[PDB]
Design a protein around this ligand. Structure first.
Ligand SMILES: COC1=C(OC)C(=O)C(C/C=C(\C)CC/C=C(\C)CC/C=C(\C)CC/C=C(\C)CC/C=C(\C)CC/C=C(\C)CC/C=C(\C)CC/C=C(/C)CC/C=C(\C)CCC=C(C)C)=C(C)C1=O
Ligand SMILES: CCCCCCCCCCCCCCCCCC(=O)OC[C@H](COP(=O)([O-])OCC[N+](C)(C)C)OC(=O)CCCCCCCCCCCCCCCCC
Ligand SMILES: CCCCCCCCCCCCCCCCC[C@@H](O)O[C@H](CO[C@H](O)CCCCCCCCCCCCCCC)COP(=O)(O)OCC[N+](C)(C)C
Ligand SMILES: CCCCCCCC/C=C\CCCCCCCC(=O)OC[C@H](COP(=O)(O)OCCN)OC(=O)CCCCCCC/C=C\CCCCCCCC
Ligand SMILES: CCCCCCCC/C=C\CCCCCCCC(=O)O[C@H](COC(=O)CCCCCCC/C=C/CCCCCCCC)COP(=O)(O)OCCN
Ligand SMILES: NC(=O)C1=CN([C@@H]2O[C@H](COP(=O)(O)OP(=O)(O)OC[C@H]3O[C@@H](n4cnc5c(N)ncnc54)[C@H](OP(=O)(O)O)[C@@H]3O)[C@@H](O)[C@H]2O)C=CC1
Ligand SMILES: *P(=O)(O)OCC(C)(C)[C@H](O)C(=O)NCCC(=O)NCCSC(=O)CCCCCCCCCCCCC
Ligand code: SF4
Ligand code: SF4
Ligand code: SF4
Lengths: 114, 208, 156, 176, 341, 77
């Protein structure tokens, strides 16, 4: 019904805020790679930014989109201020987790997981 | 005498009831309910958008000088439509009293920040946001306060597992601490303690 | 043999100095760090044994992990441990550092500092008394006494 | 009632002004602090000569755990799991079954001493005085696994410390 | 299978992988990586060590409670070898040294010890043996190191016919010799190269790829009695490779030719060190030797591993050798070296 | 304007998701080239990287053709 708008009254304003946040995250990857002394490429960082933006592409609620951009802005400011360490930036990549099988036969061989 | 039973104070009960009626009359637009618990605690349930008016009244009014904010917290009740319940505990030094104000909200509805009324609301609302997911509208600096950097989820919600989803260890291959899915050497043993017999008839709910 | 005897005496000299001059880093996390203060206190004077607190990790030989290690603190603990130059030792004090402790089944706590750093001594208690921590320190000294680095090298 | 901790004003007579000027120019309170430290220097130190001297303890002290026996040698524990229920830290694991003679006895009794918070609730909740928290506090190990006690280790602790455990329980059982 | 060897869990720290592995030479470069991968998947690891126990401390966090077990062993002691391999179904052989000490020779560390490990393991009932050799293991090699590798490979195959013999090319990583050997030559003025490094072709392999292949060879049921070659994707001339190393480290690269006999004399000078030598004559021979091409042998692709190019992981190793002026330079700031493919 | 067009085409051809043969000065990003919002945002940011002036979000959303890009640059000099 008539729900309270948090930041955006319509999905177009939410898309605008998403684009602004994407520009901010895109323009900060070189600085992050330089400051944190990461061993990844700038292209890898931008690909990760796109991938993290793109796993929420199914959302059709302007309030959920507003909350997502709020949390994205908070975690952008954690990166800029170097509050995060190299540990967290690399936690975005799961470099230590083993490749989880995705086919029925492999899951059947491994164990009881659905 | 009754040595093992807590004595009651009907004078304080009457004073709190009178002040609750006073506040409910002064602020009809927002106050939805007023209660006085039998251990003499006044509780005022308001509509969620009367937070700033009601708190400013309780702070600045001459007959209610609640200048101090003792606490600010939330309670998660998943069975409600508005699961989150914001609780304000105020202390009046002039009249040596304490009051409670209660508000409700859900995940997607913001609550106006009360940092313009009390300065302690800053960190109190940061903690509420961090631990429950409640967003406060005009907050000077709203970010995580207690959880780890990049921590996903709000741990104090009832539907959050006790041990969370990830755990940390040091990996020698990458020479850094890593985050991996949680995995317990001994799983937490959940005990069913509730007795099948009713303890307090005075709180018995109608069969409905 | 002559060389065997010489290297034995040399590493006895080297182990004696290391065991007799222990410099813990000033690193306390929680209530267990109060018992460390009481070990420093006059009743169980730790400076008497040659054990002196230093603030810089570069000038520290022992890390006494005394308190609960959280997920937000584990990177900092590992960082200071790495910045300690070798030889370096770790004493995990109390339940929270040994394993989880009272906070084992929590989303925010590391279940033992031995997931982060190599631990040499484990002192149990909540909190271990100052005498218990002192016993752990002396046990660490006796463990240092058994090191044979030059003896291993000569036969290597 | 209340009192003011700093609300006095100095006297402005010439003698008092000269005394304060002398204190400023001649460091009187600084020398007074020096005298206090020198007095402590000539006092006797409070340091005990550990490990040859030990600090005072009481019968109520909670140290290492132990499983006790009756004078006949029979185990006191009847596998009632009250200690497991009451344990704040979930540090006790118990599994039981009928013994060959039909006794209600434990087959597994574990205490994770790295999870234990040494609160003593298990010996309050024990109805037969089986599990106790003994007087031993110097049991630090070199590996984590050595701190995960089992039934054999706890029975060994009880057998080693039984005399002192019995004496402490005798001394303190009238307060319980 | 025994009921305690059945896998349980999700392949995490607190799971059970059904692998009981005795890792000889775990107190080294490849050893620490293999132990890390095993403990990470949640296996039982036995670490025989001859060194000071202080030097085995970095392996303690690698596994859950009770999963890493340390036992003392002697290389020339079949009794200790049996003690450590008695209860394990996998035995991994990473024992080797790049120089000859007073008590152990290349024949001892590469022929006598591997044969004893393979022979005792067969008696003890060990199901799988993994043995690490070198890619250029040639019986007629100029290098005594590689001749011993060839002889020991033959002896291991004879003693334990169901072995997996793995032949890495030149492993590079944080604690390696390769990149650090080439990057530490800045102290001795210029870089001495035989034939200016124009007659040497090398394809190094990455340490994580090597350890992942070793782990996958354990889990592969049809690699029982086989021989693999672990090589990188790109082959480089030695001059190009060293020039790229110095470019990534941001050090001034001044290569000069050095005749083979003079370089042998220099290597003989450095091998009188009682401690770990900086370089040796066999090290010089191995550096000058080109990596062999063995297209018949299987490889990392056959074990399911995509080999990691040097251009992606070189900055991990070589950033330590930069100066403060150049520490923060990014990975893509240096153009890749020319390959010979 | 020819220099502006050349610089715009140079930036576009460097983009990995643009096919150089399919690219033209009147190719629509969403329709002809089949890109989405984030790709167009990246392209506009790349244009900012070249000509060194700030393009706001409101103006950037009206730059769906290379000809529109060169027109915007020319108007803003
Ligand atoms: C993190 O939270 C926490 C806190 O909050 C911060 C706390 O507060 C606490 C509680 C802790 C405290 C309150 C501690 C606070 C205490 C203090 C501030 C005071 C304690 C005292 C100190 C800190 C002093 C420290 C001093 C130190 C460490 C000095 C020791 C160092 C050295 C001795 C090395 C330097 C000396 C050298 C190198 C000697 C060299 C000599 C020579 C070379 C001479 C030889 C020369 C030759 C040529 C040899 C040849 C000689 C010959 C041949 C002669 C022989 C001939 C003969 C005839 C014999 C806790 C637990 C906590 O958790
Ligand atoms: C520079 C100073 C000059 C004046 C010196 C005056 C006397 C100094 C007295 C104090 C000595 C201090 C050292 C104490 C420790 C003793 C051990 C020690 O020194 O070990 C050193 C090093 C030790 O190597 P290390 O680095 O492994 O040692 C680490 C320390 N350990 C292992 C002991 C714990 O020993 C050697 O280098 C000896 C082995 C043979 C090396 C051959 C090198 C040849 C010459 C070098 C240059 C070659 C290229 C030239 C190119 C151009 C040619 C034209
Ligand atoms: C400042 C300038 C120095 C320059 C360098 C010169 C160095 C001078 C030599 C210094 C020698 C110091 C000797 C230390 C004596 C040890 C004291 C004794 O107690 O040690 C015992 C034995 O310690 C070791 O076994 C031997 C250490 C000393 C011997 C070293 C080798 C001989 C020194 C000579 C140099 C080596 C050359 C040999 C030929 C190459 C063990 O006792 P400990 O358990 O701790 O005490 C615990 C406290 N209690 C008793 C209350 C419980
Ligand atoms: C010219 C003056 C010569 C300079 C004298 C020596 C300067 C100091 C050299 C130094 O300290 O570093 C040598 C360095 C230190 O190694 P670490 O990083 O400590 O590895 C140990 C890891 N645990 O040793 C090396 O690895 C270098 C080995 C390559 C040497 C190759 C030999 C060829 C050089 C000789 C050329 C001269 C011919 C004439
Ligand atoms: C016949 C005519 C002769 C003419 C000469 C007359 C001169 C004799 C009378 C004047 C002498 C005055 C003494 C001079 C020294 C005064 C220094 C001073 O200024 O006093 C203190 C400053 O001095 C200090 O505060 C000392 C701080 C450090 C103290 C820590 C160590 C001191 C304790 C050790 C005692 C030292 C003993 C000295 C022994 C020397 C052995 C060689 C004032 O500072 P404040 O109180 O902060 O206020 C000023 C602004 N309102
Ligand atoms: N890394 C490389 O460039 C390549 C290596 N290889 C081979 O892979 C294996 C592992 O290589 P790497 O990690 O680099 O080698 P390291 O030198 O780093 O490690 C060697 C290991 O073997 C042990 N060891 C050495 N000699 C003896 C001995 N006499 N008795 C008992 N233990 C001994 C060492 O133990 P401790 O420290 O206790 O003495 C250490 O654990 C070796 O066989 C090597 O030849 C093959 C191709 C390339
Ligand atoms: P066009 O506008 O049609 O398409 C736009 C997209 C693709 C986003 C969607 O089609 C879309 O508009 N979906 C609508 C729902 C939506 O708004 N989705 C996006 C939500 S905003 C959001 O998800 C922000 C997330 C923050 C990203 C975190 C960044 C972390 C990266 C770490 C980088 C570290 C490397 C150094
Ligand atoms: S083990 Fe006990 S005393 Fe020590 S830090 Fe934890 S809760 Fe505090
Ligand atoms: S002392 Fe407390 S924490 Fe320890 S086993 Fe007993 S009940 Fe559990
Ligand atoms: S409370 Fe006592 S009798 Fe009951 S299970 Fe525990 S130790 Fe045994």
């Amino acid at each position: 019904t008539s729900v309270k708008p948090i930041f955006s009254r319509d999905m177009n304003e939410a898309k605008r805020r998403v684009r602004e946040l994407y520009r901010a995250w895109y323009r900060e990857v070189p600085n992050t790679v330089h400051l944190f002394q990461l061993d990844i490429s700038v292209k890898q960082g931008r690909d990760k930014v796109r991938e993290m933006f793109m796993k929420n592409a199914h959302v059709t609620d302007p309030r959920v989109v507003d909350l997502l951009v709020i949390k994205g802005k908070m975690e952008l400011e954690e990166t800029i201020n170097v509050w995060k360490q190299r540990t967290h930036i690399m936690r975005f990549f799961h470099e230590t987790e083993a490749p989880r099988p995705t086919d029925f036969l492999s899951k059947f061989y491994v164990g009881h997981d659905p | 005498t009754r040595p093992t039973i807590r004595p009651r104070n009907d004078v304080v009960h009457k004073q709190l009831s009178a002040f609750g009626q006073y506040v409910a009359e002064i602020l009809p637009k927002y106050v939805q309910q007023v209660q006085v618990s039998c251990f003499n605690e006044l509780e005022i349930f308001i509509h969620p958008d009367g937070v700033i008016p009601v708190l400013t009244f309780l702070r600045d009014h001459t007959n209610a000088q609640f200048k101090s904010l003792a606490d600010l917290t939330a309670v998660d009740v998943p069975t409600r439509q508005n699961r989150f319940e914001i609780v304000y505990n105020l202390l009046s030094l002039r009249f040596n009293s304490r009051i409670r104000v209660k508000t409700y909200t859900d995940e997607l509805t913001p609550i106006e920040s009360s940092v313009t009324v009390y300065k302690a609301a800053n960190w109190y609302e940061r903690e509420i946001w961090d631990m429950f997911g409640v967003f406060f509208a005009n907050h000077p600096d709203l970010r995580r306060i207690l959880t780890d950097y990049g921590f996903e989820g709000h741990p104090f919600r009832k539907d959050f597992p006790l041990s969370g989803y990830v755990e940390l260890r040091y990996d020698d291959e990458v020479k850094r601490v890593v985050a991996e899915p949680v995995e317990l050497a001994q799983e937490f043993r959940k005990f069913d303690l509730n007795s099948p017999w009713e303890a307090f008839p005075a709180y018995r709910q109608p069969p409905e | 043999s002559r060389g065997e005897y010489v290297v034995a005496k040399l590493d006895d000299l080297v182990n004696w100095a290391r065991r007799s001059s222990l410099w813990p880093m000033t690193f306390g996390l929680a209530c267990c760090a109060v018992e460390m203060m009481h070990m420093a206190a006059p009743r169980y004077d730790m400076d008497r044994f040659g054990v002196v607190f230093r603030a810089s990790p570069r000038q520290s030989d022992v890390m006494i992990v005394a308190g609960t290690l959280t997920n937000k603190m584990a990177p900092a603990l590992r960082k200071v441990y790495d910045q300690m130059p070798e030889p370096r030792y770790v004493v995990s004090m109390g339940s929270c550092a040994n394993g989880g402790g009272y906070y084992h089944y929590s989303y925010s706590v590391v279940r033992g500092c031995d997931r982060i750093v190599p631990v040499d001594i484990y002192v149990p208690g909540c909190p271990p008394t100052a005498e218990a921590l002192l016993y752990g320190i002396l046990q660490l000294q006796r463990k240092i006494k058994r090191e044979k680095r030059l003896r291993i090298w000569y036969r290597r | 009632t209340y009192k003011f901790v700093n609300m006095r004003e100095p006297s402005m007579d010439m003698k008092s002004v000269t005394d304060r000027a002398a204190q400023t120019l001649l460091w009187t309170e600084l020398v007074r602090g020096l005298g206090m430290t020198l007095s402590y220097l000539f006092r006797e130190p409070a340091t005990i000569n550990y490990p040859f001297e030990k600090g005072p303890l009481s019968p109520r002290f909670r140290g290492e755990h132990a499983l006790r026996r009756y004078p006949s040698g029979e185990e006191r524990c009847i596998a009632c799991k009250l200690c497991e229920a009451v344990c704040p830290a979930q540090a006790i694991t118990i599994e039981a079954e009928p013994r060959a003679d039909g006794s209600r006895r434990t087959t597994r009794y574990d205490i994770d001493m790295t999870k234990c918070i040494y609160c003593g609730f298990c010996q309050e909740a024990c109805p037969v005085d089986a599990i106790v928290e003994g007087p031993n506090f110097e049991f630090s190990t070199e590996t984590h696994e050595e701190l995960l006690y089992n039934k054999e280790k706890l029975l060994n602790n009880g057998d080693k410390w039984e005399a002192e455990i019995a004496a402490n329980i005798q001394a303190d059982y009238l307060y319980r | 299978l025994h009921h305690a060897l059945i896998p349980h869990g999700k392949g995490g720290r607190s799971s059970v992988s059904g692998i009981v592995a005795t890792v000889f030479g775990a107190t080294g470069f490849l050893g620490r990586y293999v132990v890390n991968h095993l403990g990470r998947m949640g296996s039982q690891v036995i670490v025989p060590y001859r060194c000071e126990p202080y030097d085995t401390m970095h392996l303690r966090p690698m596994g859950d409670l009770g999963q890493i077990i340390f036992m003392e062993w002697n290389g020339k002691d079949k009794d200790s070898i049996r003690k450590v391999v008695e209860h394990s179904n996998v035995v991994i052989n990473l024992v080797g040294r790049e120089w000859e000490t007073k008590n152990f020779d290349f024949e001892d560390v590469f022929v006598k010890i591997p044969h004893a490990i393979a022979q005792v393991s067969k008696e003890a009932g060990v199901e799988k043996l993994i043995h690490i050799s070198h890619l250029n293991a040639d019986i007629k090699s100029p290098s005594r190191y590689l001749r011993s590798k060839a002889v020991g490979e033959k002896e291991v195959r004879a003693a334990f016919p169901e072995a997996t013999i793995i032949k890495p090319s030149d492993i590079f990583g944080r604690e390696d010799r390769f990149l650090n050997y080439f990057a530490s030559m800045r102290w001795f003025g210029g870089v001495p190269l035989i034939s200016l490094g124009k007659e040497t072709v090398k394809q190094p392999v990455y340490i994580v790829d090597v350890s992942k292949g070793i782990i996958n060879a354990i889990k592969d049921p049809d690699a029982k009695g086989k021989t693999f070659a672990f090589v990188g994707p790109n082959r480089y001339l030695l001059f190009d490779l060293v020039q790229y190393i110095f470019a990534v480290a941001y050090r001034p690269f001044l290569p000069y030719p050095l005749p083979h006999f003079a370089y042998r004399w220099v290597g003989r000078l450095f091998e009188v060190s009682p401690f770990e030598p900086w370089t040796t004559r066999d090290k010089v021979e191995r550096v000058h030797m080109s990596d062999m091409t063995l297209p018949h042998l299987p490889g990392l692709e056959d074990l399911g591993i995509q080999a990691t190019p040097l251009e992606l992981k070189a900055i991990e190793v070589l950033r330590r050798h930069r100066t403060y002026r150049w520490l923060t330079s990014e990975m893509e700031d240096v153009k890749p070296a020319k390959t010979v493919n | 304007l020819e220099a502006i067009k050349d610089r715009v085409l140079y930036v576009l051809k460097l983009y990995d998701k643009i096919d150089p043969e399919k690219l033209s000065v009147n190719s629509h990003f969403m329709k002809d080239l089949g890109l989405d919002s984030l790709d167009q945002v990246e392209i506009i940011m790349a244009m900012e990287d070249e000509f060194g002036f700030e393009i706001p979000d409101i103006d950037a959303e009206k730059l769906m053709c290379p000809q529109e890009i060169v027109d915007y640059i020319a108007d803003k000099k």
